[PDB]
């Protein structure tokens, strides 16, 4: 059986940017008159644990990534265009 | 600037197993008298989108992964022990 060693689990779970699949409407809530394809996008976002309830995992560097996304108005045409999304490039455990 | 091309976003977002950080208490709700270090673990879990509201992304192959976790409980001190977690090895879009 493969067992993940403690120090590896700890390092791999600690606060860091991790690819996270995010629904486009979480980021563009006012665009719900459209259907988007794909409907979700992979974004780097802070995730994981700090193992100290006085601390939270928060971004320390942010930027935007642009992706080609198809926009559909039901029963009308499709159009592919650029959409930008917030990413987290660096993460740290900071006091809450 | 980098722009992710449509077909690449579509492929990268589509229903598949993705590393997901999961709180251990969520997987072991019976053990809330424990403190775990780390408090979360990275698990392969189905994620992403199917781009069809008739379909949902669900596991088609499942197994357990075992990890060394520091377990802390009154009268046992802190000790490392094996804990197993459900993982999704294969994912498919299936009718809801």
Swiss-Prot record, chains A, B:
Glycans are attached at residue 64. Disulfide bonds join 15-57, 46-91, 50-93. Transmembrane segments: none annotated. Induction: By hypoxia. Regulated by growth factors, cytokines, gonadotropins, nitric oxide, hypoglycemia and oncogenic mutations. Higher expression in pituitary tumors than the pituitary gland. It is linked to Microvascular complications of diabetes 1: Pathological conditions that develop in numerous tissues and organs as a consequence of diabetes mellitus. They include diabetic retinopathy, diabetic nephropathy leading to end-stage renal disease, and diabetic neuropathy. Diabetic retinopathy remains the major cause of new-onset blindness among diabetic adults. It is characterized by vascular permeability and increased tissue ischemia and angiogenesis. Belongs to the PDGF/VEGF growth factor family. This is Vascular endothelial growth factor A, long form. It comes from Homo sapiens. The chain holds residues 219 to 313 of 395 of the full protein.
């Amino acid at each position: 059986m493969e067992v993940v060693k403690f120090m590896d689990v700890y390092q791999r779970s600690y606060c860091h940017p991790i690819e996270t699949l995010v629904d486009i409407f979480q980021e563009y809530p006012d665009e719900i008159e459209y259907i988007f394809k794909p409907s979700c996008v992979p974004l780097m976002r802070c995730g994981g644990c700090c193992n100290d309830e006085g601390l939270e995992c928060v971004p320390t560097e942010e930027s935007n990534i642009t992706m080609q996304i198809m926009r559909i108005k039901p029963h009308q045409g499709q159009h592919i265009g650029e959409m930008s999304f917030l990413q987290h490039n660096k993460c740290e455990c900071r006091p809450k």
